[PDB]
Design a protein around this ligand. Structure first.
Ligand SMILES: Cc1cc2nc3c(=O)[nH]c(=O)nc-3n(C[C@@H](O)[C@H](O)[C@@H](O)COP(=O)(O)OP(=O)(O)OC[C@H]3O[C@@H](n4cnc5c(N)ncnc54)[C@H](O)[C@@H]3O)c2cc1C
Ligand SMILES: Nc1nc(=O)c2c([nH]1)NC[C@@H]1CN(c3ccc(C(=O)N[C@@H](CCC(=O)O)C(=O)O)cc3)CN21
Length: 469
């Protein structure tokens, strides 16, 4: 009996469904496989910082698997089509009787998995819904359709959660054969860049410690602090969650352990709501695959006449729009691979609704930079800002970057952190530095608004209006 565990976006020993399931049979030979697909990653616009996070978790996992007496067979092919052949070869070469793997919901990943299952004729394959707390299809509407509005989805989700809460499975124990010697460190052949390991922990114990600490302190204050970018009021666990360094059940159980009432509206319930948004978006692409194929959820939005303007898109990408809160947000992204949620909303809105540039442009750019890049969450957030998605912002909802900035970064603390050239404009005017610049006969080394919000807004409303006709 030989059990093969095919890792992907789940590089952890703890609470890993396919892994725990392969090791139940203590008399079975257990092998782990990991296939690097540098070319499919490039196509999917994988961020260099995330590629680096994965590489780091991959070496740390190899080391942890060795102590459990489980060996990792590393392979590097080009794409998902090639991987099918590699899984076939590894099964054949090692006489694998059973394959255990955790499901991936994106169109390309699913197609690969379906091919692997068809190809493995004499093998028993068991996939697991490890990336979600509740599996797609667990929370369905009365006519067995997926929910289209979050509010009722959430209600039904909490209901089913209560009828049987999934539990955290433990890290497997050492194999009968004993510990083994780790193979030499792997190096992913994909452009990679560094990141703050303090904010985004690469080690499993560090990820867990960060979840612990947040749930103890942060989850209670969350509702009151989550809106301020200048404040560290969010978990910064999105990178671990996106790559599989942590599972959503670890977050759930650790949350309820510190905030008991989180399930019933008490403290910690607002943070839980966000984990339910994550759930929503993952089930949604599972039932609506076209969301993985650049299609909007609201068909008529495809009729909006987006602006083809290279100068405007470039200014947004480089953070030279002339709107401090938008610019500071882009420098944050470009330099750390992460952006505060409030700012992901503001910058995405600025691109689609002030510049009227196709949301797919902003999405791709975000993916290319985001250490937490994830199709369901990114596509979902972009379709929300653009009013093209499921339960998205209403088309007439056009965030005003100055108002947004005055609210959430009233003092310009965050702003002055990322825009050193504005570290002399006094407090309030910092949100509209050029208006003050003239009235002081001063030259700022900062751009001027590339668009006037009032007129931009009018033009956009007209465009949507015309498409919605
Ligand atoms: C245009 C846009 C693009 C986005 N791109 C991504 C992306 O690629 N990857 C990603 O993980 N999130 C994305 N989101 C949500 C995003 O803001 C992040 O979740 C991030 O801010 C989390 O930082 P945190 O870990 O400190 O979050 P916390 O606030 O501490 O939230 C905890 C966990 O819940 C999940 N979460 C939080 N907000 C959302 C959400 N609205 N939808 C789904 N899950 C959520 C994340 O897995 C997160 O780690 C996007 C939002 C917008 C508006
Ligand atoms: N991580 C990840 N996984 C993905 O699967 C995925 C991404 N990211 N990023 C975007 C790409 C592109 N995706 C796509 C885009 C188009 C088709 C597509 O046009 N396929 C049609 C073709 C039919 C025809 O040839 O007429 C289909 O119906 O299968 C499929 C997947 C999904 N993709």
């Amino acid at each position: 009996t030989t059990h093969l565990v095919w890792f992907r976006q789940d590089l952890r020993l703890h609470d890993n469904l396919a892994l725990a399931a392969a090791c139940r049979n203590s008399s079975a030979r257990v092998l782990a496989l990991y296939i690097a697909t540098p070319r499919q990653w490039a196509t999917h616009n994988m961020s260099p910082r995330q590629a680096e996070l994965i590489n780091a978790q991959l070496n740390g996992l190899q080391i942890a698997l060795a102590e459990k007496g489980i060996p990792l067979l590393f392979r590097e092919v080009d794409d998902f089509v090639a991987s099918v052949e590699i899984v076939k070869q590894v099964c054949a070469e090692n006489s694998v009787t059973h394959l255990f793997y955790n499901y991936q919901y994106e169109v390309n990943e699913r197609a690969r998995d379906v091919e692997v299952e068809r190809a493995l004729r004499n093998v028993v394959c068991e996939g697991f819904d490890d990336s979600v707390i509740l599996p797609p299809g667990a929370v369905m509407t009365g006519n067995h359709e997926m929910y289209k509005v979050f509010t009722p989805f959430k209600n039904a989700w909490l209901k089913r959660l209560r009828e049987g809460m999934p539990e955290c499975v433990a890290a497997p124990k050492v194999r009968s054969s004993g510990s083994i010697e780790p193979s030499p460190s792997i190096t992913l052949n994909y452009p990679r860049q560094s990141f703050d390991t303090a904010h985004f922990p690469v080690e499993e114990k560090a990820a867990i410690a960060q979840l612990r600490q947040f749930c103890q302190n942060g989850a209670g204050e969350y509702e009151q602090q989550r809106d301020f970018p200048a404040v560290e009021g969010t978990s910064r666990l999105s990178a671990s969650l996106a790559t599989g360094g942590l599972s959503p059940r670890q977050c759930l159980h650790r949350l309820l352990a510190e905030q008991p009432q989180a399930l019933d509206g008490g403290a910690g319930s607002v943070w839980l709501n966000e984990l339910i948004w994550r759930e929503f978006y993952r089930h949604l692409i599972t039932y609506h695959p076209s969301l993985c194929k650049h299609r909007p959820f609201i068909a008529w939005t495809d009729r909006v006449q987006w602006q083809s303007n290279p100068a405007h898109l470039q200014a947004w990408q480089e953070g030279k729009t002339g709107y401090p809160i938008v610019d500071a947000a882009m420098r944050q992204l470009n330099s750390t691979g992460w952006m505060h949620n409030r700012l992901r909303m503001i910058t995405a809105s600025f691109l689609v609704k002030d510049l009227l540039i196709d949301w797919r442009e902003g999405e791709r750019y975000f993916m290319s930079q985001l250490i937490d890049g994830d199709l369901a969450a990114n596509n979902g957030g972009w379709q929300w800002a653009a009013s093209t998605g499921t339960d998205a912002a209403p088309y007439f909802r056009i965030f005003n970057p100055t108002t947004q900035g005055e609210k959430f970064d009233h003092e310009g603390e965050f702003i002055r952190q990322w825009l050193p050239e504005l570290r002399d404009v006094p407090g309030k005017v910092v949100h509209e530095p050029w208006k003050w610049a003239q009235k002081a006969g001063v030259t700022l080394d900062y751009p001027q608004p590339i668009v006037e919000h009032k007129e931009a807004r009018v033009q956009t409303l007209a465009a949507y209006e015309a498409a919605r006709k």
